[PDB]
């Protein structure tokens, strides 16, 4: 049941047209997808000796950009050069512009090895791989496999039933978060479940639809320091997000258990958080809610930023509204009709960090539980800081807690880069921060409301999948396995037909593939036949037989999408009042057959009309 099954290669006829229809079959579009790259790569190395060396090079180049030092580089760059550039010059089979080749040669003998040494080479490898080598790859059956995985992706519909749910590990006013495994591929995730009822009663439909859009904005790029989304979906009572799993609990809790943090410990958290902000801020997103309860730990102690409901997009219109958590919101935030951009988080970063050192927010003094007290203390009062702090730590907090935007560290035209080069962080090497290499300081262990179809329209375009995420999730688990198991199940059947002849070859067949027509509905009879669409007729067959039925384009009156058992079908209306219904094995199949049958009959009918012998004479 619960593992992935790939469709049969027959699916190639259909998907390839589905993609060609969308300009999705470029070299450029396929290379940039994890699964594509993988399949493409297999192809070149193992199946096509002409291009093996071209990719090997591409990769050997790739690894060289991760290499940490200049002594690791100059060492590697000679080897790479010696092995992939030089040797080929001597046999005159090095097809790359000499401007590229001497751009490298010049720097090697002059010992200057930045990570972008070989950047004109990448480019030119891609020019060499595009089109012609790419062509033999489409014709190759690695591209068959690509269409197979692609069909799965484009047919993802999730329900609560695709994951096994575990312990509740999060609570808020509007729902809760559970940990969970996705059966499909075995991956552990968080599942956030907002309840629509609790939403309507509390009027928060925006501040939830927002949280999703925002997670879309951010979840590409693989950030180690934000809690990201791989999927969203819903059921009638619940919205649901599949999120990165963080089972260390938040800082707001861990603060109380540990008590205040040292500067050194605090530095760590602040570091990660910065990078987390950076990512957001490049994608033109202000978080706004920044505080200890919105920062979670993983099992190892590393942290991430979570819950982007208040985060908004300044990419088009800046915000003016006073929306954040009292005690962390900046001055410019507080005053209505006063706009603000990324600037705002840096102030909050400030306040949060005071809080990890000190027990309380900087402005929450006198244990005050009243708001208008801090409102005013933050805007009016400049900020006073324990002389227990070191001075470079002051240098930082002073900069961050500037009430003036023009004087605030983080806001002065270089965004986060400034903050990172505060002297408070002088001891750190941020490549290592980002590879999470620094050891972390702490290592853990009623209603009477109704729901109108006016509200399901509210949550219409909510289901979503981040493709880059799905392909990764897959890539790092089952992809290699499943390709093997399939490779076997297909190699049985091809070896076994030895029925070999292929009916679509040598002809003018548009498209072919499986679908199940409907016999007697009352018997839930669905014959599953192989169909062939020709320009004037739609033939289909069972087994051990060439097509022995068909339906002509000229007798088709209309094609419509219709649900039967809420399981969406194609309904064709025939000339003599008759009806013909087909269910195809996936969303994109349906879409394509609906297009192609529509185009097919429309044209054929109009073409026939113009031929006396074939036309009708009423």
């Amino acid at each position: 049941s619960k593992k992935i099954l790939l469709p049969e290669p027959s699916i190639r006829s259909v998907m390839q047209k589905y993609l060609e229809d969308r300009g999705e079959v470029t070299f450029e579009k396929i290379f940039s997808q994890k699964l594509g790259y993988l399949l493409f790569r297999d192809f070149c190395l193992n199946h096509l000796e002409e291009a093996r060396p071209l990719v090997e090079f591409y990769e050997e180049i790739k690894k060289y950009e991760k290499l940490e030092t200049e002594e690791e580089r100059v060492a590697r760059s000679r080897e790479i050069f010696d092995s992939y550039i030089m040797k080929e010059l001597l046999a005159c089979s090095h097809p790359f512009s000499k401007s590229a080749t001497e751009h490298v040669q010049g720097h090697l003998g002059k010992k200057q090895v930045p990570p972008d040494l070989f950047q004109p080479y990448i480019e030119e490898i891609c020019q060499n791989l595009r089109g012609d080598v790419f062509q033999k790859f489409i014709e190759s059956d690695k591209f068959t496999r690509f269409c197979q995985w692609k069909n799965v992706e484009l047919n993802i519909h999730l329900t609560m039933n695709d994951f096994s749910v575990h312990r509740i590990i999060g609570r808020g006013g509007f729902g809760e978060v559970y940990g969970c495994r996705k059966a499909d591929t075995g991956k552990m995730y968080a599942m956030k479940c907002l309840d629509k009822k609790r939403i309507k009663m509390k009027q928060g439909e925006t501040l939830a639809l927002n949280e999703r859009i925002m997670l879309s904005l951010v979840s590409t790029g693989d950030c180690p320091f934000i809690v990201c989304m791989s999927y969203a979906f819903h059921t009638p009572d619940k919205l649901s997000f599949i999120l990165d799993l963080m089972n260390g609990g938040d800082l707001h809790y861990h603060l109380s258990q540990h008590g205040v943090f040292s500067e050194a410990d605090m530095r760590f958290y602040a570091a990660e958080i910065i990078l987390g902000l950076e990512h957001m801020h490049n994608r033109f997103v202000v978080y706004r809610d920044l505080k200890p309860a919105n920062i979670l730990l993983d099992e190892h102690g590393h942290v991430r930023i979570s819950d982007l409901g208040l985060a908004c997009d300044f990419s088009k219109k800046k915000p003016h509204a006073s929306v954040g958590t009292h005690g962390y919101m900046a001055p410019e935030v507080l005053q209505k009709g006063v706009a603000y951009d990324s600037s705002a988080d840096w102030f909050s970063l400030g306040c949060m960090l005071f809080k990890l050192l000190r027990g309380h927010s900087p402005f929450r003094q006198h244990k005050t539980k009243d708001k208008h007290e801090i409102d005013r203390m933050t805007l009016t009062m400049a900020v006073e800081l324990p002389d227990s702090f070191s001075p470079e730590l002051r240098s930082l907090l002073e900069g961050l807690l500037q009430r003036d935007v023009n004087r605030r560290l983080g806001c002065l035209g270089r965004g986060a880069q400034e903050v990172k080069e505060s002297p408070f962080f002088r001891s750190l090497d941020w490549q290592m921060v980002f590879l999470q290499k620094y050891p972390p300081p702490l290592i853990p262990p009623t209603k009477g409301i109704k729901l109108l179809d006016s509200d399901q329209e509210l949550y219409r375009n909510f289901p979503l999948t981040i493709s880059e995420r799905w392909q990764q999730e897959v890539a790092e688990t089952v992809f290699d396995t499943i390709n093997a198991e399939t490779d076997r199940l297909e190699a049985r059947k091809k070896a076994k037909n030895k029925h070999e002849e292929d009916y679509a070859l040598g002809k003018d067949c548009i498209m072919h593939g499986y679908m199940s027509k409907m016999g007697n509905p009352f018997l839930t009879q669905w014959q599953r036949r192989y169909f062939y669409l020709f320009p004037n007729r739609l033939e289909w067959r069972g087994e051990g037989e060439a097509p022995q039925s068909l339906l002509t384009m000229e007798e088709i009156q209309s094609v419509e999408e219709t649900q039967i058992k809420e399981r969406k079908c194609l309904l064709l209306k025939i000339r003599g009042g008759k009806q013909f219904i087909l269910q195809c094995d996936s969303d994109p199949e349906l879409v394509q057959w609906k297009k192609e049958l529509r185009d097919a009959y429309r044209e054929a009918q109009q073409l026939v009309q113009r031929v006396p012998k074939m036309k009708n004479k009423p």
């Binding site: 002809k507 003018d508 007729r537």
Partner: protein, 339 residues
């Protein structure tokens, strides 16, 4: 001016050519045959059915051996049937779906077909391993192929919606001669029996007589009110019948250069789709668009018989070189044979 004299001359030449003919109208064929005995009723029954085509049948043609024939269908196939036994000697899947016509080379060795692909394709019937290769794809026409007939295994004459017909050297695929002249899509064509002449009927509501070897039009007969869907020589080579969309058939004599006889009734309004004489030329079989073939007495022009059977248009028919049987294709996806 230059054209207006040439238009003037064409008009006063048609008037002249009209009178040349009126000068030979001393008698009607009807008068001339008023004395001979009727043929009576002709009852013909369905000796065979040929099922196998999955869709409309558009054309058929007997092999000269009066046994084999080729059919061509909306189902994108040629079948060659053993008429005696209903046995598909060959199914032949085509490369375009849009076939409209087919022919059986008199030798038995090739068949030809074509349609909206605008090409006549020669299929070879027994090669090296007795497989069914395509031998040529006579491309040259710029409109749908409407009919085609082999002269022998080396030459073939086609007709087309490009308003022309043409002669081909199969060997080199060369369009040897072309017969411009018609002013409307050309529809059926028929080879004289000596094979140095042939006639063609078209949508300009004319038939034309052509000299194969000279590549010119000898004569032009007119007087149908609408498209001419089909055409066939009287066996002696001196006259031909045409069937039209206007619900009539018409016999034309070559030598008197004119119409001799009209075959029609008030009851019949549907158009004609195919024609063929019996062996002696006494019977004119025509296929209609109401699902009947009507049989006509050629010499008298009374309706002598009907071949009722098919449930949709009769697209095509032919009589066998020996005279034994009539074949008939339809839109109902069958051929049927009748004595």
């Amino acid at each position: 001016s230059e054209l207006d004299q040439l238009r003037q001359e064409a008009e006063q030449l048609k008037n002249q050519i009209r009178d040349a003919r009126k000068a030979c109208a001393d008698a009607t064929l009807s008068q001339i045959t008023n004395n001979i005995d009727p043929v009576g009723r002709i009852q013909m029954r369905t000796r065979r059915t040929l099922r196998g085509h999955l869709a409309k049948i558009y054309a058929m043609h007997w092999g000269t051996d009066s046994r084999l024939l080729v059919s061509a269908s909306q189902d994108g196939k040629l079948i060659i049937w053993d008429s005696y036994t209903t046995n598909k000697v060959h199914a032949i899947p085509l490369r375009s779906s849009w076939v409209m016509t087919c022919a059986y080379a008199p030798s038995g060795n090739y068949v030809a077909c074509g349609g909206l692909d605008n090409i006549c394709s020669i299929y070879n019937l027994k090669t090296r391993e007795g497989n069914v290769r395509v031998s040529r794809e006579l491309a040259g026409h710029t409109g749908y192929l409407s009919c085609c007939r082999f002269l022998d295994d080396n030459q073939i004459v086609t007709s087309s919606g490009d308003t022309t017909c043409a002669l081909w050297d199969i060997e080199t695929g060369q369009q040897t001669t072309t017969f411009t002249g018609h002013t409307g899509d050309v529809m059926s064509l028929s080879l004289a029996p000596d094979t140095r002449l042939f006639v063609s009927g078209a949508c300009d509501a004319s038939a034309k007589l052509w000299d194969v070897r000279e590549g010119m039009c000898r004569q032009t007969f007119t007087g149908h009110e609408s498209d001419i869907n089909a055409i066939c020589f009287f066996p002696n080579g001196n006259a031909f019948a045409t069937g039209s969309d206007d619900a009539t058939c018409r016999l034309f004599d070559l030598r008197a250069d004119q119409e001799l006889m009209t075959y029609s009734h008030d009851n019949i309004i549907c158009g004609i789709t195919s024609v063929s004489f019996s062996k002696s030329g006494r019977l004119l079989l025509a296929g209609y668009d109401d699902f009947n073939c009507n049989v006509w007495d050629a010499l008298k022009a009374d309706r002598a018989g009907v071949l009722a059977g098919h449930d949709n248009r009769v697209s095509c028919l032919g009589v066998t070189d020996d005279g034994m049987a009539v074949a008939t294709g339809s839109w109902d996806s069958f051929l049927k044979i009748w004595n």
